[PDB]
């Protein structure tokens, strides 16, 4: 709930308006460059399906993780900025990211 980037964005993007979500990652690149990962390095997903893709380059990301003392309604997050390879699961047509699988 409010002040640092994670508390504000988790609320504005409707992730913590009615619950506290333990972890969430935000990617800070242009949307089309993130969508472009679906034709980059094909890798297996954690669940064994093979519709996951890893970005060739690292991307700027912000990890938001609830502190050990966060409780609904006052969710509280620690903000960590990183540049990581993202791994996304892709589906559909256009073949676009539908889930985060990991980040390296």
């Amino acid at each position: 709930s409010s002040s640092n980037y994670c508390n504000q964005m988790m609320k504005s993007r409707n992730l913590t308006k009615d619950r506290c979500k333990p972890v969430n990652t935000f990617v800070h690149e242009s949307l089309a460059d993130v969508q472009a990962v679906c034709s980059q390095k094909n890798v297996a997903c954690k669940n064994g399906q093979t519709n996951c893709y890893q970005s060739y380059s690292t991307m700027s990301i912000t990890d938001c993780r609830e502190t050990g003392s966060s409780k609904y309604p006052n969710c509280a997050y620690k903000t960590t900025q990183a540049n990581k390879h993202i791994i996304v699961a892709c589906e559909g047509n256009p073949y676009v990211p539908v889930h985060f699988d990991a980040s390296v």
């Binding site: 964005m9 935000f26 539908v98």
Partner: peptide, 15 residues
């Protein structure tokens, strides 16, 4: 209601 692709952008993307 949101598609899975729209939900991914709302939850994980910030240009």
């Amino acid at each position: 209601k949101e598609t899975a692709a729209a939900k991914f952008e709302r939850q994980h993307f910030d240009s």
